[PDB]
Design a protein around this ligand. Structure first.
Ligand code: NA
Ligand code: NA
Ligand code: NA
Ligand code: NA
Lengths: 256, 256, 256, 256
């Protein structure tokens, strides 16, 4: 068990990628705060995962909620050792149709949410004096722009950048900051994602997803489970010398 | 010469780099909107440059000011062919001292200001149906993070991403979107920049600036004139096949 | 006349892109050594271009030919101010079919040829004490690997790398070293290239070429003329502060 | 545990980084071929490591030696599952002093050695039908050039490129190709590396090594043990969806 006795918090972990990370972390001996805007779903998730997972209501766009979430983790587990910034929102629209609402919402959650949660965790970790681990969720989208995905790509580029900056600033406190960049990951969101491409590219529903899946060198779209090995690795002692990096786990969909 | 008959608008061009760009564009035969929030200096600059330059009041953080600026180029110049997003703000603080005010202010101007001005320009260019040129100002800060400069770095990373996405979306309208990434450029702003570094790096005043200058492979910090050639090139016919690129003009300070 | 009074040498300029550069340089006032293994065609080209162009026999794989070529520009033009390393060979094969012959031949021309010509030009430029410009030809292939193009991609990656190293080492002598990276350029060679892809991807003849052209965001494969502006720019005073860069001119085919 | 029953071959594994990888692999349950040009050193390393390690004489510059080594692996273990291309040579010299001997020797070992060993391993893995893992050793040097290290940097850039190309071509055979890029790693070679820098930079002995060590954000130069976690990870099932990536493990010395 590579994370034995560790205290983690994962934002947006009631469902999806964050939820898989939560389960993997518990398997590896960690206690995990299931942080989510949906307290009901967080409580269900925590009960399904087991005794070591516990629900925390959190809105990463609000400072008071961020601070309350950190304090609940300290209260419940005695401190905080691992942060995963997984909360994210996707959207899509061509340049001439980008709205200020899309820009503000996606930046508030994907960039500000990650930045200020990272900062609150950093402060707690510094106060503890024991290190150690922060993992941001980037994306292939942050590696290169895309015609219909300007806002989301830009938030993920910002995340990769913040990962580098925070990494350099916090390593003196024995805190590693790194990021994982998935490529295309299958899941409940892809119906809406495909529908959005179908609308703007004028394709039959389902065609975009299929083309995307067929283009991954590996042979298929990713699963959350493809990513858990890396999430454990970057939270363990085996990654202590790894600083300010973004690692693509994407079946070859992007090369860095 | 190279920009004969072209209508341009440059944000933040009352002073510094933007003004040097405006003066260079006029020498190359363009008509130029000196768009700045400092309308008094924009007017003095427009008056000094000559009849081909005219002052436009603009605050890239306000949608109505953005739309009014584009309307102004239509009124004065009959339309818009070249947009340079030059307006920007700098700040510096370690992760644990980053404020929401700093985040919101730098993103509103550096990211939202660039995105929505680009969008307004693109709409006008598409309506004209004669293609166009858009040049965003990035920075070495956009290429890699820095311990003390998380916010500014992230905004410039977002600009590089947006440059990429917009370039891919808009090329079918014959609009080139690219960016210039300067390195370190000398100017009065370095008193404050040095002071901020001196404080957090525990150095005597002037030392940071000195060291930064000495470390540029070319052998000196940049001037506006180092950048003017590239600004003309990316607005000229010689750059027609150039799409979604960021070009470093930085004395070798960063290699891309 | 941005290259007035300058002396240049361009490798592999009897035909194609290199010849287009030579013609462009001549129009900008330069004297140009048409250097090529195909001396017959180089002579014909120099005669067609006009009195400022002269043929020079060179095989970039042979040190004695390189040194004699540099000596030729000194003799005919009085010195050497601009070098363009354009000579290159292409090949294609899946990993399990790559031969040592293909490896040796592509590295000798593409990498050794560029490196040691660069070296010989640099020595002459340092001896002159007037600085200089060196432009290497990279490729999109140099920016990212490709299943069937391992050898060529690796040579172009080596070129980008060498451009960076040489740029850092030579700038103290006022020599700018940079590179241009074209995307896909139409031409006679595409019949063979298409044929090779057709074989390994199991495609009808001409399909690969068609798909490639349609996949370029700009909407067409490149021409030599798309590249001439950048070639002049990087040899001119407008690029003095530009060091160790590789610039993509590729219709958006790769974003750097 | 993590590599139970796997057959590995690591080039240059008698001493240094390869040796550490060999020892870590054996602890994780692998059988390891200790390939080295120095057969007595290989036979000795194998003896010391244990019964799961066996010596193989190999010159990665010779096709026949490469082919013989793979065959011995198939002879001793029942086949080959993991290849680590660790054999490498370093050299240093400014542009004007680079010799053809330095160019040829470093490229033969660092590039050709890696390419043709990877090719022979791939062929054997394809014939087995059970997939496989291949890890190339890159370097921070492959990420960006340096004034005094053009040859070595260029070889490591070529390695990163080959990693991408081979990864894309071989994943259909269920062979993962990835690379590790250490930053600066302490070891017996650094006394000579420092000496080379001291010579050309004209420094007291030891000054370069200290400055380099002090500039790593983490706080010290690397050890081989910093890298073993990643070497195991990329050879294990936890990296199955990881293709064509180069991962920096370098204390923050370079960010990718
Ligand atoms: Na629970
Ligand atoms: Na005026
Ligand atoms: Na002639
Ligand atoms: Na043994």
């Amino acid at each position: 068990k590579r994370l034995e006795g560790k205290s983690a918090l994962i934002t947006g972990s009631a469902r999806g990628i964050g939820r898989a990370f939560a389960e993997a972390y518990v398997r590896e001996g960690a206690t995990v705060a299931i942080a989510d805007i949906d307290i009901e779903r967080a409580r269900q998730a925590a009960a399904e995962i087991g005794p070591a997972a516990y629900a925390v209501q959190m809105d990463v766009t609000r400072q008071d909620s961020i601070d309350a979430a950190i304090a609940a983790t300290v209260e419940h587990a005695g401190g905080l050792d691992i942060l995963v910034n997984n909360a994210a929102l996707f959207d899509l629209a061509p340049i001439v149709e980008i709205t200020r609402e899309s820009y503000e919402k996606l930046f508030a959650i994907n960039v500000a949410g990650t930045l200020f949660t990272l900062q609150a965790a950093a402060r707690q970790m510094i106060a503890q004096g024991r290190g150690g681990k922060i993992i941001n969720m980037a994306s292939q989208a942050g590696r290169r722009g895309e015609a219909l995905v300007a806002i989301y790509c830009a938030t993920k580029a910002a995340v990769i950048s913040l990962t580098q900056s925070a990494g350099l600033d916090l390593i003196k406190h024995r805190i590693n900051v790194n990021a994982i960049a998935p490529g295309v990951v299958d899941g409940e969101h892809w119906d809406g994602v495909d529908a959005l491409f179908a609308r703007y590219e004028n394709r039959p529903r389902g065609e975009k997803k299929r083309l995307v899946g067929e283009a991954v060198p590996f042979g298929r779209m990713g699963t959350a489970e493809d990513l858990t090995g890396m999430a454990i690795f970057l939270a363990s002692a085996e990654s202590d010398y790894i600083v300010s990096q973004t690692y693509n786990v994407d079946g070859g969909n992007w090369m860095s």
